[PDB]
Paper text:
We then solved the structure of the VtrA–VtrC complex bound with CDC and observed that CDC binds in the same hydrophobic pocket of the VtrA–VtrC complex as TDC. The backbone amide of VtrC Y151 forms a hydrogen bond with the 3α-OH of CDC, and VtrC Y81 makes van der Waals contacts with CDC. Specifically, the coordinated water molecule between H50, Y151, and the R2-OH of CDC increases the distance between the H50 and Y151 side chains, as compared with the TDC-bound structure, where they form a hydrogen bond. The position of the Fα helix containing residue S123 is impacted by crystal packing and shifts away from the CDC binding site in one heterodimer compared with the others in the asymmetric unit.
T3SS2 expression is regulated by VtrA–VtrC, a member of a newly described superfamily of bacterial “co-component” signaling systems. The transcription factor component (VtrA) includes an N-terminal helix–turn–helix DNA-binding domain (DBD), a single transmembrane helix, and a C-terminal periplasmic domain, whereas the sensor component (VtrC) includes a transmembrane helix followed by a lipocalin-like periplasmic domain. In the case of VtrA–VtrC, VtrA functions as a membrane-bound transcription factor, whereas VtrC in complex with VtrA senses bile. When VtrA–VtrC bind bile acids in the periplasm, the VtrA DBD is activated in the cytoplasm.
Residue numbers in the entry:
A (entry chain A): 165 to 253
B (entry chain B): 29 to 161
The structure:
Amino acid sequence: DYPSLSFQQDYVYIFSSDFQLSEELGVALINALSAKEIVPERLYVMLNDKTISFSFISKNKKSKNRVLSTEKKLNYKHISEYIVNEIEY
Amino acid sequence: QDPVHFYETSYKYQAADSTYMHDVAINVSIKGNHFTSDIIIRELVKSENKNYYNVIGHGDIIQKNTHQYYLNFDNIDVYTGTNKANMKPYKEPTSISSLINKSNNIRVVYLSEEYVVVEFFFYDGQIITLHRY
Ligand SMILES: C[C@H](CCC(=O)O)[C@H]1CC[C@H]2[C@@H]3[C@H](O)C[C@@H]4C[C@H](O)CC[C@]4(C)[C@H]3CC[C@]12C
Ligand SMILES: [Ca+2]
């Protein structure tokens, strides 16, 4: 099956089978987006074995959807930095 | 009685070796338990559009619950070309040809009147928002 909802706070919804990683990434995402003064309507993140994906939802705009293939496993900091750079750009 | 519902979105994909990116448009229309879909892939391999793919699919969409669906394709066709205006049929690779032999899971994680958020089967797992029309 797909991973279920493993961390949820404010606008962030993380789907992963790693509960610890989910919280680390969720807190890092909230802190990084506040540092950029970026507030999504909702931000969905899915962590899988060889792929990360996210959907940044903003009111009355098309969602920003991204997929990153990773052969090497990425730590929560690099994942957070990826999402934050993609949303900005 | 079933009215036709329209969904659309796009995403960008970054390859593992970061040698290419895909810009992928998804269009899907549903009537009753039937669907047809068009997916367009633009391949950027040099910060430069050097390949296009057009994937057409149709079949049944089965509802397990209001949040769990599965897509049973009857057929998937692929076209390719370096220009969108002159696309040619492309022989399905057995891996993509075999997506027709798997009930492909769609899990709704958020449902609204203007959009839906799903986990679905691209890359063996992807989260995406689809906009309704
Ligand atoms: C068949 C071609 C070319 C592959 C090759 O032989 O190199 C693929 C290039 C991009 C792929 C598509 C692209 O990666 C997005 C989708 C991903 C999903 O896992 C399968 C269907 C997809 C819609 C998929 C279908 C197959 C193509 C269209
Ligand atoms: Ca076919």
